[PDB]
Amino acid sequence: DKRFRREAEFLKLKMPTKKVYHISETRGLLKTINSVLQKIPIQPKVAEHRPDSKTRSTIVYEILSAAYPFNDRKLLYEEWQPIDLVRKYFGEKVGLYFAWLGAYTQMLIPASIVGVIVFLYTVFFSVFMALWAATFMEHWKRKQMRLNYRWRFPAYFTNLVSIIFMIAVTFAIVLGVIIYRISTAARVTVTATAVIINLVVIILLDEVYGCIARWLTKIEVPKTEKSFEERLTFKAFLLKFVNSYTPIFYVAFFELCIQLSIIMLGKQLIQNNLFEIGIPKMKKFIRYVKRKQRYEVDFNAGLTPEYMEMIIQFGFVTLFVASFPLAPLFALLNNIIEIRLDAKKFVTELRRPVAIRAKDIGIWYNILRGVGKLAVIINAFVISFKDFWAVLAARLAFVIVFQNLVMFMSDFVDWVDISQQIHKEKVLMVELFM
Amino acid sequence: DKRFRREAEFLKLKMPTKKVYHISETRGLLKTINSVLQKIPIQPKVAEHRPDSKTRSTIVYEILSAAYPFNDRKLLYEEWQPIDLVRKYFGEKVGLYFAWLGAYTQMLIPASIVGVIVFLYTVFFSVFMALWAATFMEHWKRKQMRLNYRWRFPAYFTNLVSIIFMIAVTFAIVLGVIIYRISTAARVTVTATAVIINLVVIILLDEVYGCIARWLTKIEVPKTEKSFEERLTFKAFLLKFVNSYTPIFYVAFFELCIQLSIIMLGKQLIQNNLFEIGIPKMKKFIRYVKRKQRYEVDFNAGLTPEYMEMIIQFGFVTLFVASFPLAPLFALLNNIIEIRLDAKKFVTELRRPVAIRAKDIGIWYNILRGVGKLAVIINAFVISFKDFWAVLAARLAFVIVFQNLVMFMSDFVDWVDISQQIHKEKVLMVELFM
């Protein structure tokens, strides 16, 4: 692993005392910023007392201006399922990211088929769709165990402040859609353009409220780098899910589901893929013996949004699971596509580090559980949506039995291996201990 | 621990080989049935290798016709909160039984106060009552951690058979109430007598369907004595909760809540207390040097129903939590009363054994969680219960927002210590290990 860099020199000598702990390193000088690499077994045996080059620079990070750290990576380049050297090389938490990502593809897999069978020849698609959700959570957890075998008051005042400015942004979005209706007001295509500039403004407000949430999480003085990012993700899916889901919410009570699917595909392709590849050309044209050349390539890395958008994709998977079926299929196309571009995007990365000790997606996981939770009553609530009073009455009745039958089916699924190998493995642990 | 008793003699010698394992015992002969006591430190040190007289006869049971096993018990007799020698003497699982029983009293404690404040001067009692339920589960679990610190197809064919005969008994109860209406048919007091004979018939059908469920669980060939009793309890609360809750269900859709409270108090006093003390007089009049006299007293022990009725008491706590408030207060009187009679009932027991290794009530615990779960929508569903169509419409609307606000408050409570002592305790474990 390497490093970049008066008080920098003196505290650099203070850092060299930490190099004098048990470390072995070297320096490299070019382009008016310092750089220092390192590599060191007996000291790694002391590291083995504290708790395989991935583990090596990993433990170097456990030891610790800027800083950093390929024929097997080229073996990935030909090779890109990928979980073996993906875990061995890319990392564990991101290995879960591509892993449960590919699981999200696997949930996407048989689901679109029955949706095509639906669109051939009506709410049973939504019912068994919710079943597909619960099963997706189910084998998500089961497979999570499988790869687990394969491996003070002013803060709450600011919480109320984020509540108030949050709903202020929400009604601001309501001004986006209502003023969008005024914008297309004075055939369908004027509203299509208003949806185009509207989702463009959503592309604006995503970075706007998003980096605003970076100020919300950055101004919270987070000591730990596990819970601060967690609640930062909580606000992220909060305002972001408000941002995305807000327009379809304006569609529902305040048809245009084709525009919703256009925003789905363009949000997949034109926004995420094309803008994401645009960022590679942004840094690229902004710029535009073996280990020496790779160290030169070092001059040439968040995950949560790349997690969260899949959440948004799951939010794509959930909400309009009410209306139109076929968005799941092309959604799965964007899934496998963004899987491949995710892989090559990881190839394009700025030297992403290791990340150890994680069971699952956690905040994202139970966040998805709650996504199903709000999703059921939500999509039902749109699904039902003189004597017309009694019509809406019967509508509310189907809402009710829809709710009770819905969660009843949810618990019915919730009724649902290698612990035998855990037991005999522990018997072997005492046996080798003997 | 002791024992009672041709092939009995030969297999008795086979048992004496198990006495020749590491055991020390003695025999005693009277009244045409055999009896053998036992007591044995080095062999108990071998028992300490396998995993304090309670632990002694406990491990004797771990070693194993009929069989069995008091100035500290008299110290309980004056002493009867009781958790110290209750755990030390009475046992751990039953110590949880009296423990979370007294916790159920503690939930009963401040709850009746606001109910009196209600009955002075309307659904907010039910709302905060559900809050009292969720908190009851909450500090039930938290206190459970606190005392935790202080310590193939034909079977499913029979499951369908129990379903069919179960609903057959349910409609049979519907014949009980409807034929009870025919019975009082040809002022209110004729219906009071019909309720009297009705609940008497419920007292019949409790033992009837109850021992029928003993045939359901006894004919299931249960190998283990942990899951068979669990599902036996599941059928027990199933048919029993159907039995009790069936009449008020007949009251609701098919006022008489005073008769419901009369069945509550009489079910507490006349049924449970008076019939229970009647069983002591049943065996008593059916019958009607220190260790010698106590061994003579040995000639002179289920728990689940004694658990389950509290469930029924919780089922008393839940359902008519819709209608009338003051049944909680006298219910708490029956709670403290049945706590005392529970204590002296444990004094009256037929030499109850030890029971180790249990975190909590389990089947009963999440059974109570589901009791709240069905309870919320249930009591709401009774609580809302030309243009009268639109009246029931608005009724259904309050049902809906009642449901969403209800579970919303439930999760709001579900947002909610000595693990520090666990950590420093483990630091002391390595330290004493050092």
Numbering used by the authors:
A (entry chain A), B (entry chain B): 123 to 127, 167 to 201, 204 to 214, 242 to 254, 278 to 282, 295 to 305, 315 to 355, 409 to 438, ...
Anything the authors wrote about it?
TMEM16A is a member of the large TMEM16 family of membrane proteins, also known as anoctamins. Calcium-activated chloride channels (CaCCs) are important constituents of diverse physiological processes, ranging from epithelial chloride secretion to the control of electrical excitability in smooth muscles and neurons. These ligand-gated ion channels are activated upon an increase of the intracellular Ca2+ concentration as a consequence of cellular signaling events. Although it was initially anticipated that all TMEM16 proteins would function as anion channels, it is now generally accepted that only two family members (the closely related TMEM16A and B) are ion channels, whereas most others work as lipid scramblases, which catalyze the passive and bidirectional diffusion of lipids between the two leaflets of a phospholipid bilayer.
Here we have resolved this controversy by the structure determination of mouse TMEM16A (mTMEM16A) by cryo-electron microscopy (cryo-EM) at 6.6 Å resolution and a complementary electrophysiological characterization of pore mutants. For that purpose, we generated a stable HEK293 cell-line, which constitutively expresses the (ac) isoform of mTMEM16A, and purified the protein at a saturating calcium concentration in the detergent digitonin. Due to the presence of Ca2+, it likely shows the channel in a Ca2+-bound conformation. In light of the irreversible rundown of TMEM16A-mediated currents observed in patch-clamp experiments at high Ca2+ concentrations, it is at this point ambiguous whether this conformation corresponds to a conducting or a non-conducting state of the channel. The protein shows a similar overall fold and dimeric organization as the lipid scramblase nhTMEM16. Hence, the interaction of the subunits within the mTMEM16A dimer differs significantly from nhTMEM16 since the cytosolic domains do not contribute to the dimer interface. Instead, interactions are established mainly at the extracellular part of transmembrane α-helix 10, which is in a similar location as in nhTMEM16 but extends further towards the outside. The pore region of mTMEM16A, also containing the regulatory calcium-binding site, is formed by transmembrane α-helices 3–8. We could further constrain the position of the conserved calcium-binding site, as density between α-helices 6, 7 and 8 coincides with the position of the two bound calcium ions of nhTMEM16. As a consequence of conformational rearrangements, α4 and α6, which line the opposite borders of the membrane-accessible subunit cavity of nhTMEM16, have come into contact at the extracellular part of the membrane to form a protein-enclosed conduit that is shielded from lipids.
